[PDB]
Amino acid sequence: RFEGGQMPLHMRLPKLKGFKNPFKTEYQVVNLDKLASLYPEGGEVTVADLVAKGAVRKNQLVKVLGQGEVSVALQVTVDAVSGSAKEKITAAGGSVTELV
């Protein structure tokens, strides 16, 4: 961290913009493409069961996201879901029930 007296790189560029949120929570996210390979025959999809299939860390909030396509009906019981994912699940005959 020393450029021979010249003003260091880390001391002439401005600090990064903004603050940080001490209580922001990040969800463990599951895309539909990789959620349609764990359940190739449909069925109910609980959070504690998603943990056992190695798709999300333990003890966090899940949020299904909408990348990919789903061809079978899934009854997902998660903490949140994106708009595109919710449409795709419903189109395939599934139902989305949020806890939060």
Partner: peptide, 19 residues
């Protein structure tokens, strides 16, 4: 000091703000 001036992207690039 440097942790306050640089951010790393999703591909590992390191980015700055203009002075």
């Amino acid at each position: 000091g440097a942790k306050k001036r640089f951010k790393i992207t999703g591909s590992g690039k390191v980015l700055r703000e203009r002075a």
